[PDB]
Amino acid sequence: PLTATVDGIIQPMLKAYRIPGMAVAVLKDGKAHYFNYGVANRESGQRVSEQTLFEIGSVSKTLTATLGAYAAVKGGFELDDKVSQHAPWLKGSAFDGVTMAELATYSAGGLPLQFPDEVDSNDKMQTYYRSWSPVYPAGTHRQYSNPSIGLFGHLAANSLGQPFEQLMSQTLLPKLGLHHTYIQVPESAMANYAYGYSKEDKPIRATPGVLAAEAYGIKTGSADLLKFVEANMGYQGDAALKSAIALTHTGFHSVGEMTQGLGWESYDYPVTEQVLLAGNSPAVSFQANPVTRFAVPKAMGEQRLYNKTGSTGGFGAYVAFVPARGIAIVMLANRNYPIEARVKAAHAILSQLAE
Ligand code: NA
Ligand SMILES: [Zn+2]
Ligand SMILES: [Zn+2]
Ligand SMILES: [Zn+2]
Ligand SMILES: [Zn+2]
Ligand SMILES: [Zn+2]
Numbered sequence: 001p002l003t004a005t006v007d008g009i010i011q012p013m014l015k016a017y018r019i020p021g022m023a024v025a026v027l028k029d030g031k032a033h034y035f036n037y038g039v040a041n042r043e044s045g046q047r048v049s050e051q052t053l054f055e056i057g058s059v060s061k062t063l064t065a066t067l068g069a070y071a072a073v074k075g076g077f078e079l080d081d082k083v084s085q086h087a088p089w090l091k092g093s094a095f096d097g098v099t100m101a102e103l104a105t106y107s108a109g110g111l112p113l114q115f116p117d118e119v120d121s122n123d124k125m126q127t128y129y130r131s132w133s134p135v136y137p138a139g140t141h142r143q144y145s146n147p148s149i150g151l152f153g154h155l156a157a158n159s160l161g162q163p164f165e166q167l168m169s170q171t172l173l174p175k176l177g178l179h180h181t182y183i184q185v186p187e188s189a190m191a192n193y194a195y196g197y198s199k200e201d202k203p204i205r206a207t208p209g210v211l212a213a214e215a216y217g218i219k220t221g222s223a224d225l226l227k228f229v230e231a232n233m234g235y236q237g238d239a240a241l242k243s244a245i246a247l248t249h250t251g252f253h254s255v256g257e258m259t260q261g262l263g264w265e266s267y268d269y270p271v272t273e274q275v276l277l278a279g280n281s282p283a284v285s286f287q288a289n290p291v292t293r294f295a296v297p298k299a300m301g302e303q304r305l306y307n308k309t310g311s312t313g314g315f316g317a318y319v320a321f322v323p324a325r326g327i328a329i330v331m332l333a334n335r336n337y338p339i340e341a342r343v344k345a346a347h348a349i350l351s352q353l354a355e
Contacts, residue, residue: 002028005352006035009345010331014038017337019316020197021048025222027233027321027328028353032226040194040334043203050223053185053193054332055206056317057310060218061149062248063181063228065263067164067172068104068156069247073240076159079104079247079297086155093130098138101297103152105252105260110135110288111145115210125210136288142255143288149263150211165213175241176231181220183213193219194334196314204314216312222330229321229328232264232306251300253291255284259300260291266304269322273347280309280343305350309343311336318342320350327353 006024014022014037021038034050072079077086083095083103090096098108111132119128129151135141157164162171165183173181185193195203206216232249235242251259251266258279259266267279278284302324310317316336321328329346 002026002033003035006349009348010035010037013337013341013345017335017341019333019335019337021052021194022331022333023048023050023052023054023222024332025050025226025330026349026353027226027230027326030326032223032230034222036222040192041203042195042197048194049221051180051192051221052332053180053182053189053219053221054317054334055196055216055312055315056218056220056225056332057206057216057312057315059225059308059310059317059319060214060216061310062263062308062319063168063172063218064149064153064164064214065104065248065261066176066244067168068100068152069244069262070172070241071156071160071167072100072247073243074160076156083108083151083155086159087129087151089126090129094132094134095129097134100152100155101252102139103148103155104262106142106145106148107139107253107260107291108134108145108148109138110141110143111148112143113145113286115147120210122210139253139293140290141288142253142260142291144285146211146215150215153214154211168213175238177227178220178224181218181224181228183217183219185219192221194315196312197335198314199336206312206315216310222332225319225330225332226328229319229330232321233323233326233328246299249300249304249306250297251294252297253293255279255289255291258284259304261300261306264306264308266300266306269303269305269324271305273344276305276307276347277340277343280307280339285309307346309339311339316342318346320346322350322354325354329353
């Protein structure tokens with residue numbers, strides 16, 4: 001049984017981690033199912049719905065990756081192009097020796113998790129990339145990195161002659177049928193925007209930063225985010241967007257049991273909880289690891305679990321889907337609670353959905 005299942009997993013988790021609100025959406029047998037808990041705003045008491053806007057943090061990277069793939073499919077660049085081919089200001093830099101695909105998959109050579117301290121203007125960002133010295137040879141190490149995929153999204157949008165935000169809001173989101181998903185939440189929708197809650201229980205929301213839109217800037221609810229997942233299960237429409245989504249299901253290297261694609265990370269299905277936790281642990285996400293290189297990028301197919309974790313100061317999100325079994329789960333919360341718990345919860349739920 002569906003509702004009691006989700007409730008049984010989710011609600012104890014909300015109490016244990018003091019999660020004020022969570023929106024959950026699952027895909028099964030071709031239908032969306034919504035389960036909503038608690039409040040978007042603990043002081044007003046406004047209840048969470050599938051239309052409540054959450055910061056989804058790095059789940060945004062899957063949309064950025066899709067935009068990037070779309071630009072590639074439309075001929076703005078080839079994934080194997082050197083980065084400086086698409087960044088005149090980077091010619092002569094280390095990015096002469098880095099591909100767009102490496103940049104998208106955090107394997108450029110040791111770009112850090114966050115921009116350094118005062119790399120926080122466009123002009124200082126440009127100087128930063130220009131003067132960057134690789135820690136590792138290109139394509140040998142995976143180090144999860146906002147600068148890395150941030151630059152990828154930025155240059156990809158530029159290859160079509162548009163700012164990232166414009167290409168996302170005027171082309172990609174509308175073509176995916178996502179009309180309630182935002183990089184900047186309009187006044188008209190501000191009523192739906194949840195508050196995040198810090199470790200100290202203060203209401204907070206993410207602020208704009210250098211390449212923040214690209215790396216972790218999407219606000220959306222569970223309904224829209226599930227629609228994006230549905231497009232990843234079977235999109236039939238514009239051939240280009242279909243081809244783009246297909247590119248995000250391509251694997252470029254692996255780290256242990258996890259295969260890195262564009263935005264999505266995936267596992268061989270069926271996958272155990274232990275393997276899913278490991279692939280999403282600090283061991284993989286907060287340090288550089290040598291990769292298992294692929295002879296050529298590989299279409300990963302349907303017998304996979306695809307996922308992405310996402311966090312901001314006040315928000316915690318998780319998404320996972322399994323195309324061959326037609327199941328997916330979206331979990332959006334307004335507290336940045338341990339990824340470990342997100343993963344157990346989702347695994348327990350998906351396990352039941354499969355059955
Ligand atoms: Na069974
Ligand atoms: Zn239902
Ligand atoms: Zn500054
Ligand atoms: Zn630029
Ligand atoms: Zn629209
Ligand atoms: Zn696919």
